[PDB]
Amino acid sequence: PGATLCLGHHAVPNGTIVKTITNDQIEVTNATELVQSSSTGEICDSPHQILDGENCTLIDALLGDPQCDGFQNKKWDLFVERSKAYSNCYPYDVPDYASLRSLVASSGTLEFNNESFNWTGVTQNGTSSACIRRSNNSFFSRLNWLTHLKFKYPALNVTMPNNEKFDKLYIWGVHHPGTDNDQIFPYAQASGRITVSTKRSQQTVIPNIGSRPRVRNIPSRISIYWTIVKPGDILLINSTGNLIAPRGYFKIRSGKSSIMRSDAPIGKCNSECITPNGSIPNDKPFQNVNRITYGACPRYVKQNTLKLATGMRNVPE
Amino acid sequence: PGATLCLGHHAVPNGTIVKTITNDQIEVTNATELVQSSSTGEICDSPHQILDGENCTLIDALLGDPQCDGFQNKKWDLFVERSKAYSNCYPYDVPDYASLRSLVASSGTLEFNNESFNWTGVTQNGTSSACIRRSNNSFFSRLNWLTHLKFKYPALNVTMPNNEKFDKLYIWGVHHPGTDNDQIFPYAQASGRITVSTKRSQQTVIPNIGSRPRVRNIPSRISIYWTIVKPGDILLINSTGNLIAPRGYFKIRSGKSSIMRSDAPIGKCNSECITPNGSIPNDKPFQNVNRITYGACPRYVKQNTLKLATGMRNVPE
Amino acid sequence: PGATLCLGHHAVPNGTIVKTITNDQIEVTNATELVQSSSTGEICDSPHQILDGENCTLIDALLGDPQCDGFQNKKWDLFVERSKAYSNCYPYDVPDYASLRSLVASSGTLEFNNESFNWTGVTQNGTSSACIRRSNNSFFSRLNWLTHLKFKYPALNVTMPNNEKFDKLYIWGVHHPGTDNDQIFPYAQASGRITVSTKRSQQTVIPNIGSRPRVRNIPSRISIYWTIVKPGDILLINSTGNLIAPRGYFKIRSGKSSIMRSDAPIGKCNSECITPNGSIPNDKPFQNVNRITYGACPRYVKQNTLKLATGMRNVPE
Amino acid sequence: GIFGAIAGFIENGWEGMVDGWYGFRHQNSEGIGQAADLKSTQAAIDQINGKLNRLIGKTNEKFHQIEKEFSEVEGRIQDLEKYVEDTKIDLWSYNAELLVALENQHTIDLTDSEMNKLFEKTKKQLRENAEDMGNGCFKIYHKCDNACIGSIRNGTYDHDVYRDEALNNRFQI
Amino acid sequence: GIFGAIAGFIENGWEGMVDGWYGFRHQNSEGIGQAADLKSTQAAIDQINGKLNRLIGKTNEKFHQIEKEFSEVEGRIQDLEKYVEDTKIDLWSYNAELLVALENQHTIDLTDSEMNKLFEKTKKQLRENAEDMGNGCFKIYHKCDNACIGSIRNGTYDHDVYRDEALNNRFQI
Amino acid sequence: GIFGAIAGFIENGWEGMVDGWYGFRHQNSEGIGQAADLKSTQAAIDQINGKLNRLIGKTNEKFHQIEKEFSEVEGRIQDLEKYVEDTKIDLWSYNAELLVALENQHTIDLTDSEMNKLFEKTKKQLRENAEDMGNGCFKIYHKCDNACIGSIRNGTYDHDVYRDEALNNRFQI
Ligand SMILES: *[C@@H]1O[C@H](CO)[C@@H](O[C@@H]2O[C@H](CO)[C@@H](O[C@@H]3O[C@H](CO[C@H]4O[C@H](CO)[C@@H](O)[C@H](O)[C@@H]4O)[C@@H](O)[C@H](O[C@H]4O[C@H](CO)[C@@H](O)[C@H](O)[C@@H]4O)[C@@H]3O)[C@H](O)[C@H]2NC(C)=O)[C@H](O)[C@H]1NC(C)=O
Ligand SMILES: *[C@@H]1O[C@H](CO)[C@@H](O[C@@H]2O[C@H](CO)[C@@H](O[C@@H]3O[C@H](CO[C@H]4O[C@H](CO)[C@@H](O)[C@H](O)[C@@H]4O)[C@@H](O)[C@H](O[C@H]4O[C@H](CO)[C@@H](O)[C@H](O)[C@@H]4O)[C@@H]3O)[C@H](O)[C@H]2NC(C)=O)[C@H](O)[C@H]1NC(C)=O
Ligand SMILES: *[C@@H]1O[C@H](CO)[C@@H](O[C@@H]2O[C@H](CO)[C@@H](O[C@@H]3O[C@H](CO[C@H]4O[C@H](CO)[C@@H](O)[C@H](O)[C@@H]4O)[C@@H](O)[C@H](O[C@H]4O[C@H](CO)[C@@H](O)[C@H](O)[C@@H]4O)[C@@H]3O)[C@H](O)[C@H]2NC(C)=O)[C@H](O)[C@H]1NC(C)=O
Ligand SMILES: CC(=O)N[C@H]1[C@H]([C@H](O)[C@H](O)CO)O[C@@](OC[C@H]2O[C@@H](O)[C@H](O)[C@@H](O)[C@H]2O)(C(=O)O)C[C@@H]1O
Ligand SMILES: CC(=O)N[C@H]1[C@H]([C@H](O)[C@H](O)CO)O[C@@](OC[C@H]2O[C@@H](O)[C@H](O)[C@@H](O)[C@H]2O)(C(=O)O)C[C@@H]1O
Ligand SMILES: CC(=O)N[C@H]1[C@H]([C@H](O)[C@H](O)CO)O[C@@](OC[C@H]2O[C@@H](O)[C@H](O)[C@@H](O)[C@H]2O)(C(=O)O)C[C@@H]1O
Ligand SMILES: *[C@@H]1O[C@H](CO)[C@@H](O[C@@H]2O[C@H](CO)[C@@H](O)[C@H](O)[C@H]2NC(C)=O)[C@H](O)[C@H]1NC(C)=O
Ligand SMILES: *[C@@H]1O[C@H](CO)[C@@H](O[C@@H]2O[C@H](CO)[C@@H](O)[C@H](O)[C@H]2NC(C)=O)[C@H](O)[C@H]1NC(C)=O
Ligand SMILES: *[C@@H]1O[C@H](CO)[C@@H](O[C@@H]2O[C@H](CO)[C@@H](O)[C@H](O)[C@H]2NC(C)=O)[C@H](O)[C@H]1NC(C)=O
Ligand SMILES: *[C@@H]1O[C@H](CO)[C@@H](O)[C@H](O)[C@H]1NC(C)=O
Ligand SMILES: *[C@@H]1O[C@H](CO)[C@@H](O)[C@H](O)[C@H]1NC(C)=O
Ligand SMILES: *[C@@H]1O[C@H](CO)[C@@H](O)[C@H](O)[C@H]1NC(C)=O
Ligand SMILES: *[C@@H]1O[C@H](CO)[C@@H](O)[C@H](O)[C@H]1NC(C)=O
Ligand SMILES: *[C@@H]1O[C@H](CO)[C@@H](O)[C@H](O)[C@H]1NC(C)=O
Ligand SMILES: *[C@@H]1O[C@H](CO)[C@@H](O)[C@H](O)[C@H]1NC(C)=O
Ligand SMILES: *[C@@H]1O[C@H](CO)[C@@H](O)[C@H](O)[C@H]1NC(C)=O
Ligand SMILES: *[C@@H]1O[C@H](CO)[C@@H](O)[C@H](O)[C@H]1NC(C)=O
Ligand SMILES: *[C@@H]1O[C@H](CO)[C@@H](O)[C@H](O)[C@H]1NC(C)=O
Ligand SMILES: *[C@@H]1O[C@H](CO)[C@@H](O)[C@H](O)[C@H]1NC(C)=O
Ligand SMILES: *[C@@H]1O[C@H](CO)[C@@H](O)[C@H](O)[C@H]1NC(C)=O
Ligand SMILES: *[C@@H]1O[C@H](CO)[C@@H](O)[C@H](O)[C@H]1NC(C)=O
Ligand SMILES: *[C@@H]1O[C@H](CO)[C@@H](O)[C@H](O)[C@H]1NC(C)=O
Ligand SMILES: *[C@@H]1O[C@H](CO)[C@@H](O)[C@H](O)[C@H]1NC(C)=O
Ligand SMILES: *[C@@H]1O[C@H](CO)[C@@H](O)[C@H](O)[C@H]1NC(C)=O
């Protein structure tokens, strides 16, 4: 009689369809998903240092809007800005807002050092009803609104050397009055000029008198500027009025920090990859959750599924 | 005697040469071209909505140069600018011309809504011999050149709320006079200032008196600016002279519109892919006609031919 | 007895490990390196035309700082800027420095043509102790510091047509005085204004009086601007003071020129690929020496080694 | 597919083989049996694990990048930011699509290869004692009990022991 | 190339086979004939059509982009626009070159595979009734008329019917 | 790996074969010899040289680009310059990694293929005069001196000359 010996291979009742170079649908015994397509919906608070902005934008926390006093000197890996944030101080604009937001975000710190500027000849600490701190009229905590002393505002010519190892970031501003009265009451003279300079740079700004639509009842504006001063360089501030002076400098660091816009809640959990939709697992090489990511993340692709065969062709009985 | 049975394969007298991983020239029985390298030389008028600029740039049609009156309120998928275009109105410049051209191009509409600004105290509708419309002196149709009323030009402080669902685009300008006479005749006073503002933004511009090389006999210039006003925000225009006022706003849309520079004729035909050289077929995955494309187009590559084998190796008898 | 016939293949005692799709370490008989990871440390002077900046930045050589007089009218493929470079003339800044540096670098020439501007009414050739040329007080060689003639500085209104085939590049400047005295001594009047224009463009600049930190004992500054004038266009300079005038124009070319920051020595040798670390061989398709390259260069990758198998699997006895 | 065993000369797979990917079925005097071949099974699995090792858990860290959503119209710089991102995403999407298509074609081919290699090895082992029937089965021309079949599966079968019996059965009239 | 049939042990192709890609020529008592094998032919064609389905008519829509030609010198922003575009084009040009080279190597290999598979299937069908001559031809050791050849081409040949005749012819002295 | 010869049914390579990549060892009445096969050797080498021709000495010229190092903090434009470059480098690094992995898998497979093709060609040449032992060796069932072995290596061996001797030795009891 003899014998029969048959060579063969397994099969499964429930195969999965994959794509190949020659066939868009071929059934294999098993496959695995290469595109991460879901999130829990929370931003995990570990292992990255998360700073929830709550009601505050980064720029508001920088300038020192009263609601942002809790942010002083804080550090982050990722600053999270919420869509409910709003400003509640003197109305302002920042020419090239996006750049200042970016450079502070990537620096990753609000560390601020007070300096004693020689402001002799003027009244310091000007305040406004549009910027309430603890029921009192107030102002941005990091800024010093200078006004007349006994109806004179003499020329200011003030210097501050950088003897540190690091770059200093100075934030400052110009007051644009709504009317003639808004120029006379604080400075009691026709017109101001501001020149802020270093060995390597200069910025001059002229106040422009004129009505702007009222914001929290104020038709004036502050325009915010910045100046980086290198080690061994010197800051020079030369003003005849309308100067919103710095109280000191921010430390500028380099490292891995950033900023993200998200309304996802922060959770107590541990995930390396953050998206605005929430943290996502990072086992897969690709993802279609969000193009915006932070951390050790899969690469964003347009496909919502890509199946890698992990078994042979399935040829059921 | 028995038999002989031979296995074999076909061959052709006229094979084609392809490239492989191991050989730069191997002959196969058949191949197909993957790089589109020709055009008919016409831009097909279907299925995209084409707007031929003819003598007009997009910016001229926007401002309302007299030769561009036929463009009022038109829409496009693709605006086509011709190298023969020329301006024939008051000479002007647009700081960041390229951005305004871009944002209007992608909006895809010249839809304009007139608004009634309260211009009491000045003479409206100023005109010039450098801008002829129907034999008469005229001006840009979308702009309102304000001048003195009885040798006075009082301060203007005019407001316009945005109560719409969409962003409004305001185009406006400043007149820079060529001489002292070009300042006195229209405004009859020393110097103008313009501040255009919203809750979120402000732009101030000062006229600068001075001779520029004459263009169509005019040594003055207009400088063109723009302001986007969001729903619920308010436009504020504050001027003491030299204001080229808006007559209303443009609708700003988002969608798939763009602009292309081309001298190709428009034809009556149907093609999904437009290049400046003409429409091209889009059956192939790649093309070397032009890096500039619009529509469902093959991807631009540097190679002028890439042949995909569609048959076996050719081994002739 | 018969015979035995065995088929086989070679092997080597010293195989090399490569990566594959299915195995991260498999031994083959031979392999070759695809990533260039070393340099000699010199920039080869052939076959590209190298211009060693030595103590001079490109911008200093352009303006004509005294130490850079040897650079007049030179051409380069690659301009090499050294970290020891320093300025030794009147202190200056260039708004958008990086753009001017770039456009001159890519033009690849310092070819300068003198022009005779009609400067009647003023004193030409102003000089300074901060800019010593051959023991004498001097100035930037390509710039003309205009001052009063007999305590008057009349309005200047000067024209220069472009009748050439090429674009002309004009470099010019404004003097910002440190004090009132620095305005009176040179111009002997309150304030200057500069408008530089063409048929297609205009730039106006106002001097701003104010103390800046002293650089080589000078608290004033020059701000440098540029203007390109097309064939058939005309340059117009209109000033009432503080103008640092051009002496002519630079030719602007297009071609393959660039600029690189490097402290590597220039050697007498021949290499097509330059990096800031030195020239590198270009036999390999990839390199991990520097992302900055010039010439026929391997493509920068992050890996420091990638081994291509050039033999079979090694299966030792 | 490329070797012709799986979905080729082997008509179908075996749903009842649950302890390996490749194996042997036999019929002899003592009945009909099945056993998995662990070495071919492990060869295929090790290759697939090699691919997975190159794809799973290998992500890159990125930190501060560019903005990718915008609330205002801005023109030229914004157009460039958007185009850079769109360009990047299309290039990665292409990479991902091609990677999976190529890897899957290769997985199908390497699994077919392992089947073919096992078949070939078994054929050579049997020498003149069996004939290939064309469907992955050998007709063995001698009495081949459970220990004999085991010997073939373990690579220890001595063809000389049965050659006289087999030749006599094969080359009969 | 990788299987060794096309441009290998098959000396050359047949220009006179115009109704299929693979096939059979024979010589027997009734003459010399040729017939295409439709199943191998269709197997190769279906795979090539699979590639074409992934390459032809699959383009992406793009609309507003960045500018890519410039009439003025501008410096930094323009340098960046140009570099982004040049970067993109080089990356796509690379993708295109590699795609075609890989696909072509694979097409050559899969077509060789189909030839080899047909040869192997035919060899197994003939059992002990034929010997392989090494050039893609079998010497069949029995009378094999047109219907018999047809039976081999249609997969219906019963080797047992001819085995006695063939063994006697083969193993003669 | 995919054909099963190299690191498969051929147990190991030969360190003493220094004049070719593939070859023959024999044992006969006149001793034990070794000779390289130049045609298989050249086939493998030509394919590898084809890859090298596509990779070595093929660089692209670039000239003025964007800046890639910065001494000052600047924000938005600088962020974009850095991101463009980082994007480019990651995409090229990916291309390089994948290229080498794919090419190496293919080199290993094509070299295994050439070994298999030589084995198959030799097997077919010997017809009924030899049997495959399963380890890349044939048992030849006739007296086969140095000239006879040479004939097999040169593709000139006439199997009919020895067939009677071989059949008688093979099919003995
Ligand atoms: C179809 O194909 C896939 C891929 O080949 C198979 O899925 C794999 O299955 C194995 C074995 O079950 C899994 O191994 C286990 O991984 C666990 C970690 O899982 C998480 O993390 C990984 C990232 O590394 C993610 O991919 C995954 O989704 C999870 O989020 C370990 O915890 C397990 O360890 C267990 O055993 C060891 C002892 O050996 C112990 O040390 C542990 O304590 C624990 O008990 C284990 O290693 C593997 O994760 C799966 N891979 C993938 C990509 O999913 C399917 O099994 C296969 N299907 C069939 C039917 O065969
Ligand atoms: C060498 O290799 C190539 C690719 O394998 C072969 O070219 C293909 O040939 C087939 C058959 O002739 C072509 O099929 C026909 O396509 C027509 C549409 O053509 C246009 O559009 C496609 C995009 O989809 C473009 O690629 C192409 O260039 C054209 O611009 C259809 O109209 C045809 O349909 C006909 O038959 C059907 C019935 O089956 C009817 O419905 C129709 O009314 C009509 O009568 C047909 O489908 C195919 O387009 C070609 N592909 C390519 C990429 O070119 C060569 O034939 C081959 N050479 C040899 C000698 O074999
Ligand atoms: C392991 O694998 C590699 C790649 O297959 C082999 O390396 C190759 O070896 C050959 C032969 O020795 C080399 O060929 C020689 O190239 C020289 C030029 O070398 C430089 O330039 C190339 C770029 O083109 C660089 O890749 C290389 O690193 C060098 O910088 C020629 O000058 C040689 O020519 C000689 O012979 C000819 C006559 O045939 C004469 O015209 C010449 O005058 C001269 O005498 C020669 O062509 C080749 O460069 C190597 N390639 C690579 C990529 O390195 C190893 O040999 C191999 N190892 C083993 C043990 O086999
Ligand atoms: C430093 C200083 O002068 N603070 C003043 C401030 C400024 O003079 C003014 O904002 C400059 O533009 O003015 C404050 O009052 C004016 C303010 O009064 C409110 O009641 C009203 O709502 C506003 O429209 C405006 O008239 C201020 O609070 O801003 C007082 C402050 O001490
Ligand atoms: C609104 C208005 O004032 N329109 C005037 C216009 C302006 O005053 C002037 O352009 C402001 O710079 O001047 C017009 O005339 C002056 C013009 O006369 C031409 O003949 C000559 O070609 C020019 O050089 C210039 O002198 C004008 O047309 O521009 C009259 C217009 O009503
Ligand atoms: C063209 C001209 O006026 N040249 C003067 C120059 C300018 O007036 C001045 O730089 C404008 O700001 O002044 C020079 O002297 C003043 C200079 O004197 C030095 O001794 C001192 O070190 C400086 O602080 C300053 O007071 C000059 O060299 O700059 C003379 C020059 O002729
Ligand atoms: C310029 O016009 C605006 C709008 O009419 C004036 O602003 C309004 O002032 C009233 C009180 O006078 C406030 O109650 C409104 O809230 C203001 N509206 C806005 C939109 O700000 C403005 O006062 C005018 N300026 C001058 C100097 O007359
Ligand atoms: C400044 O100079 C320019 C050039 O000389 C003067 O412009 C010319 O004026 C004449 C009439 O006076 C015209 O015919 C020319 O067409 C003008 N040329 C150019 C290039 O515009 C200009 O008038 C002078 N300005 C002053 C205020 O005197
Ligand atoms: C404004 O302040 C600066 C700093 O005190 C003054 O500049 C110094 O002037 C002295 C001589 O008066 C020089 O020796 C120093 O080198 C200068 N220092 C710097 C940092 O420049 C400047 O003179 C003051 N300006 C005015 C107009 O009083
Ligand atoms: C098939 O079913 C088993 C058991 O339910 C499951 O574990 C496996 O993942 C499934 N496989 C596929 C390919 O769906
Ligand atoms: C944020 O503002 C909202 C709205 O006014 C308020 O209800 C909430 O208490 C504020 N939260 C914090 C943390 O200040
Ligand atoms: C700077 O301060 C000095 C010294 O008081 C003064 O002379 C000068 O006018 C000031 N300049 C400005 C622009 O405020
Ligand atoms: C993540 O958030 C974005 C917001 O733009 C949304 O469009 C996207 O679909 C979300 N994805 C998932 C998986 O929730
Ligand atoms: C060969 O010739 C035929 C008939 O003229 C033609 O249809 C076919 O496209 C040609 N093939 C090649 C590869 O050139
Ligand atoms: C465009 O301008 C040219 C040149 O002046 C003229 O001949 C033509 O009629 C104009 N076309 C239109 C459509 O206005
Ligand atoms: C704005 O208009 C108001 C009201 O007429 C006036 O007081 C003010 O000076 C104007 N400002 C400007 C800059 O024109
Ligand atoms: C398309 O137009 C461009 C203009 O730059 C030209 O350079 C290119 O060669 C043209 N291509 C074809 C196929 O006509
Ligand atoms: C092995 O050694 C030889 C002789 O020393 C050398 O030429 C060759 O390059 C080496 N091969 C490897 C793979 O290291
Ligand atoms: C460059 O400057 C240094 C430092 O002052 C000096 O020693 C050297 O001689 C200068 N070299 C040239 C070429 O001018
Ligand atoms: C330009 O020069 C002219 C003629 O001298 C003069 O009238 C005018 O005021 C000057 N303008 C400026 C801005 O210097
Ligand atoms: C080249 O120079 C750069 C300077 O940034 C340095 O970081 C890099 O490691 C150098 N590479 C080599 C191979 O010397
Ligand atoms: C074959 O190996 C298995 C171990 O898996 C063993 O149980 C069996 O008895 C062995 N049989 C022979 C004949 O070697
Ligand atoms: C084989 O099949 C063909 C149909 O294509 C038929 O004409 C022929 O008669 C068949 N012959 C046999 C012997 O089955
Ligand atoms: C085989 O070829 C070689 C040439 O390399 C020759 O030396 C040898 O004598 C030949 N032998 C036969 C039998 O053809």
Automatic annotation (TrEMBL), chains A, B, C:
A GO biological-process term: fusion of virus membrane with host plasma membrane
Subcellular location: Host apical cell membrane; Virion membrane
Example of a GO cellular component annotation carried by this entry: virion membrane
GO molecular function: host cell surface receptor binding
Alphabetic keyword roster: Clathrin- and caveolin-independent endocytosis of virus by host, Clathrin-mediated endocytosis of virus by host, Disulfide bond, Fusion of virus membrane with host endosomal membrane, Fusion of virus membrane with host membrane, Glycoprotein, Hemagglutinin, Host cell membrane, Host membrane, Host-virus interaction, Lipoprotein, Membrane, Palmitate, Transmembrane, Transmembrane helix, Viral attachment to host cell, Viral envelope protein, Viral penetration into host cytoplasm, Virion, Virus endocytosis by host, Virus entry into host cell
Keyword Glycoprotein set for record: yes
Membrane topology: Single-pass type I membrane protein
Domain of life: Viruses
Family membership: Belongs to the influenza viruses hemagglutinin family.
Reported function: Binds to sialic acid-containing receptors on the cell surface, bringing about the attachment of the virus particle to the cell. This attachment induces virion internalization of about two third of the virus particles through clathrin-dependent endocytosis and about one third through a clathrin- and caveolin-independent pathway. Plays a major role in the determination of host range restriction and virulence. Class I viral fusion protein.
Description of how the protein assembles with itself and partners: Homotrimer of disulfide-linked HA1-HA2.
Name of the featured protein: Hemagglutinin
Originating species: Influenza A virus (A/Brisbane/10/2007(H3N2))
Source taxonomy: Viruses, Riboviria, Orthornavirae, Negarnaviricota, Polyploviricotina
UniProtKB/TrEMBL annotation, chains D, E, F:
Cell compartment(s), UniProt: Host apical cell membrane; Virion membrane
Residues bearing glycans: N154
Keywords: Clathrin- and caveolin-independent endocytosis of virus by host, Clathrin-mediated endocytosis of virus by host, Disulfide bond, Fusion of virus membrane with host endosomal membrane, Fusion of virus membrane with host membrane, Glycoprotein, Hemagglutinin, Host cell membrane, Host membrane, Host-virus interaction, Lipoprotein, Membrane, Palmitate, Transmembrane, Transmembrane helix, Viral attachment to host cell, Viral envelope protein, Viral penetration into host cytoplasm, Virion, Virus endocytosis by host, Virus entry into host cell
Disulfide feature: C144-C148
A biological process from GO: fusion of virus membrane with host plasma membrane
Domain of life: Viruses
Transferase recorded as keyword: no
Gene Ontology molecular function: host cell surface receptor binding
Cellular compartments per GO CC: host cell plasma membrane; viral envelope; virion membrane
UniProt keyword Signal present: no
Its job: Binds to sialic acid-containing receptors on the cell surface, bringing about the attachment of the virus particle to the cell. This attachment induces virion internalization of about two third of the virus particles through clathrin-dependent endocytosis and about one third through a clathrin- and caveolin-independent pathway. Plays a major role in the determination of host range restriction and virulence. Class I viral fusion protein.
Family indicated by similarity: Belongs to the influenza viruses hemagglutinin family.
Quaternary structure annotation from Swiss-Prot or TrEMBL: Homotrimer of disulfide-linked HA1-HA2.
Protein name according to UniProt: Hemagglutinin
Record organism: Influenza A virus (A/Brisbane/10/2007(H3N2))
Gene giving rise to this polypeptide: HA
Whole sequence portion shown: 330 to 502 of 548
